[PDB]
């Protein structure tokens, strides 16, 4: 269906959805529970980071024309905000500064002409997920490995818990995604910024995502690690992600 | 409005760090870090807060404009951290002092205009000290992305590192590079060599064009925390050297 190439930039900042236990803790999760039995684990909704997504409207086009995403510039925003060791963080030792945010993190983004397609996998299939979230349906023990029944569109912001969903590599013909998971108590967060780096979105045939209904989809999860309060309680900390996407007009048939 | 390349000049400079400078004898250091303040009552001492270093270099008057083509940069005095005999708390009984370690941030920028920055706060309710320039009328939205917090890095020792990042939605006429590494025990890793160069040309082959015949350099080099015998912790910073090659570029008007 895709014919000869026939330019625009779109910019976006996508805010994180870490749980937001109250206005003053926006960008944080609720304090983490621990040691629940697999058989009775009802996490509070505000405990669970979710994927961020947004649908950016493009100029109405019109042998039909479609917006083709060619490159993306993206970075995590506010990385330096973690140099505040004076407020809220538990002291590393007596008379010492506050504990830096550290621990398990996940850094992910996607650009596509359709909602990001996701596959469900659970640590614990018996986890009772909270009303308001969208999690694998009628899960079984097979849900703790690969169960092909758990397919979803990332079609709602602050809804799909990061812990239940991954990008589906068996789909996403019209999306490019990139993600890194680093797990552990003491993982140092490592984040780079530069306005000189670009990611090409073209495939092996030189075709970028083609925007269905003049709509561009951006998706992200940026869990930076755990924040430890004076009490010893722990909260996820997230940061927003910036996207700048270069598109061109592409001819397609019918 | 850029034409063909027209000839060449170097500018060499160093930016000394602004880590807080709690007293003269602690130049390159912050005041000891406080901890466990509530988000409701957090008034950091100005000398506790590292700030971005910046300066505006005047260029020959020379239409033509100065185009920055390459930069050589390194952090200066990296070996000074091999002093474990003074001030540092002993790692254990009879042992040497604790090396500087922990969260660090290494950043520099070259541009034909002041570096453009975006505000983001750990805690929007933080009461920032008089003398510093921080996000104005911050809200809970300031703990994620609030597009109201735009600033020019237009003053040395003024913009706290903790409140500002380079704004990737702007800086059309600046190149910036930064790495943040967070954690209690992060080892600082610094490389020096006079063989490395960074090209400043964009996808169209155009470097920063110096407006008002002015080159802007910016940097933050927080190397990590220094732990005193007492157990108190201070930021340690180092200066950054720049060598920038510029050429004459023709432009319309």
């Amino acid at each position, epitope marked *: 269906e895709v014919l000869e190439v026939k330019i625009t930039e779109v910019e976006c900042f996508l805010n994180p959805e870490m749980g*937001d236990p109250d206005e003053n803790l*926006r960008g944080f999760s609720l304090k983490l529970s621990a040691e629940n039995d697999f058989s*009775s684990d*009802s996490p509070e909704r*505000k405990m669970l980071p979710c994927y961020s997504t947004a649908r950016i409207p493009l100029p109405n086009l019109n042998n039909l024309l479609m917006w083709e995403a060619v490159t993306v510039q993206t970075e995590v925003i506010g990385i330096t905000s973690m140099l505040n060791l004076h407020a809220g963080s538990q002291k590393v030792h007596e008379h010492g500064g506050g504990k830096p945010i550290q621990g398990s993190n996940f850094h992910f983004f996607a650009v596509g002409g359709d909602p990001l397609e996701m596959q469900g996998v659970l640590m614990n299939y018996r986890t009772k997920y909270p*009303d308001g979230t969208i999690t694998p349906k009628n899960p079984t023990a097979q849900s703790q490995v690969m169960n092909t029944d758990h397919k979803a569109y990332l079609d709602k912001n*602050n809804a799909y818990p990061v812990e239940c969903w991954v990008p589906d590599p068996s789909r996403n013909e019209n999306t490019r995604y990139f993600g890194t998971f680093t797990g552990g108590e003491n993982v140092p967060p490592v984040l780079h910024v530069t306005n000189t780096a670009t990611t090409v979105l073209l495939d092996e045939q030189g075709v970028g995502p083609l925007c269905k209904a003049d709509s561009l989809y951006v998706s992200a999860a940026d869990i930076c690690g755990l924040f430890t309060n004076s009490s010893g309680t722990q909260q996820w900390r997230g940061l927003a992600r910036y996207f700048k996407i270069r598109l061109r007009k592409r001819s397609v048939k019918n | 409005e850029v034409l063909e390349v027209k000839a060449i000049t170097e500018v060499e400079c160093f930016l000394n760090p602004e880590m807080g400078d709690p007293d003269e004898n602690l130049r390159g250091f912050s005041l000891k870090l406080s901890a466990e303040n509530d988000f409701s009552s957090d008034s950091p001492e100005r000398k506790m807060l590292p700030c971005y270093s910046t300066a505006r270099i005047p260029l020959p008057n020379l239409l033509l404009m100065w185009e920055a083509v390459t930069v050589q940069t390194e952090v200066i005095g990296i070996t000074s951290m091999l002093n474990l005999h003074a001030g540092s708390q002993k790692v254990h009984e009879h042992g040497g002092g604790k090396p500087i370690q922990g969260s660090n941030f290494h950043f520099f920028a070259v541009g034909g205009d002041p570096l453009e920055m975006q505000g983001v706060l750990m805690n929007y309710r933080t009461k920032y000290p008089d003398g510093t320039i921080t996000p104005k009328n911050p809200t809970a939205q300031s703990q994620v992305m609030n597009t109201d917090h735009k600033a020019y890095l237009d003053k040395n020792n003024a913009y706290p590192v903790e409140c500002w990042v380079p704004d990737p939605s702007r800086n059309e006429n600046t190149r910036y590079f930064g790495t943040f590494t967070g954690g209690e025990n992060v080892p600082p890793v610094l490389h020096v060599t006079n063989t490395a160069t960074t090209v400043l040309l964009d996808e169209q082959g155009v470097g920063p064009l110096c407006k008002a015949d002015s080159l802007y350099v910016s940097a933050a080099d927080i190397c990590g925390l220094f732990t005193n015998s007492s157990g108190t912790q201070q930021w340690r910073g180092l200066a950054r050297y720049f060598k920038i090659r510029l050429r004459k570029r023709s432009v319309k008007n």
Partner: single-chain antibody
Amino acid sequence: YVLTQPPSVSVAPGKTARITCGGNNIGSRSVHWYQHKPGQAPVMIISYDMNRPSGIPERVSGSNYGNTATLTISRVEAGDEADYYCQVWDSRSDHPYVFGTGTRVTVLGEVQLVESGGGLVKPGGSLRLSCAASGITFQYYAMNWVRQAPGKGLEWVSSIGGRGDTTYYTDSVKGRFTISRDNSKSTLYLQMNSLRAEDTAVYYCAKEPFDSSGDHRGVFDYWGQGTLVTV
């Protein structure tokens, strides 16, 4: 959807109180619990089956399985004497917020929400209630009206999204009551027209948790003291 609670429970100090909440497959739904003392704002004590809000003691615990959710209060004190309500939320339903019938528990021995506009009114007449919210950015909060008629339980009346763009009414008031919102003034409104005697109640203003879109979450995490409307 129907939530069944035993009307009353009696407990000695130091003993354990157990309050059940019956529902068809309630184990598949997130149950929240509220403590309500006479002439006081209801307090949320359990969210999503077993989560305690900040300030609620470890003695208070929640359980939810099959057809029964259970509120357990251990080492019972005089201060525990109150009404207790379970509550669920079904986004995809005609009546999306449902309270239990309530349980009277007898022991043997910042943000503000301020309601106004309550008073006395002729049957068939009109009255507009206000809620002045303080210390929150109002467009980030789904807001609700919940009433208690004399000798009856908490009844959910109306809900509105943070944007003002999503409105829900109980059938009882549909066509007569209008929920509205002025985010610039941080004020919630309930326009009550065609008033009936069955509308005699204390009207409580109920905040939902902060949401980046001000969506409905199904949780009443903070309440005002109420305003009396008598017809």
